Amino acid sequence: TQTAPVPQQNVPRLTRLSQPGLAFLKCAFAPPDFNTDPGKGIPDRFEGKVVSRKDVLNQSISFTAGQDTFILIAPTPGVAYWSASVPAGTFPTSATTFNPVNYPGFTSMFGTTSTSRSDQVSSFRYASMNVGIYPTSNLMQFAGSITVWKCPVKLSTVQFPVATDPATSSLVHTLVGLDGVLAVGPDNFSESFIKGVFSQSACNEPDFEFNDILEGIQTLPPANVSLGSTGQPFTMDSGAEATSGVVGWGNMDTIVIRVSAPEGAVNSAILKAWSCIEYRPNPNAMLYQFGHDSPPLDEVALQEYRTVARSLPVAVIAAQN
């Protein structure tokens, strides 16, 4: 009662979409539906110099019978998807390794050395990432299913000590969220293989920030690092630096597709992968003369994007792409 208070100081006291905004929603959710890529850039606050590249891949593929083939549509610039197959009924194990299928022109964009990746462009940001599977098998030869779900795979880092001399500490890239591929996500599309499928990803961040181009990555775990050290459930190997590589990891959830061919099934199909990306061109690149400015902010488009993304089903059959 007789204890004076301690003095406290410094106490505080009907709109419609723009052309680029509409086009943005088209490249984002329905690219097969248009004669041309409607895309033009991201109608967000940013209006600096960019080069919009619309990557498309057409791959005729055959699924090994008795195998469960896993396809990963990941935010890896230049690379359409990553694949690997395991015995029917199982999921990728530590013994598994995914291999990339490049979008046309990978080398023209990222060089032929694992340290040439940022010679044309310095950074990027995904506007869209879509995938479709169109069965080419006859009705009586196919058998099986297509299952799709999406994973919040991010490229983080791992910290561990190494007994070198002197003793040292290592810090290396490591993909977090891959464990989500080892089970069919509760939110998923599942249907007869013959019905095909079409699906799309979406920005997994509250906004479209630019990510930098990464130099030197050819494998994750990287060379001289054990899978045990990283915590990853399996391996990503891009192969020969002169043919592919991991140039960056965008802010889009990864699409996981699992095609199940039982024994004796002839499952053939065409896989298409779309990718609308905004890159920051290097003044020295020949790529630059094609650039323009990212489109102006378009609030309506930015909100419709989020609403539409949330309202669409995980995926749909190929007949409704």
């Binding site: 088209k26 959710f29 329905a30 248009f34 419709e304 539409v308 669409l312 007949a319 409704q320 792409n321």
Partner: peptide, 21 residues
């Protein structure tokens, strides 16, 4: 476009449920 029309449907469905001030 059974996909672009699916999107146009969602756009007008929300652009209308939010235009009745």
């Amino acid at each position: 476009a059974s996909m672009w029309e699916r999107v146009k449907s969602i756009i007008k469905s929300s652009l209308a449920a939010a235009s009745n001030i």
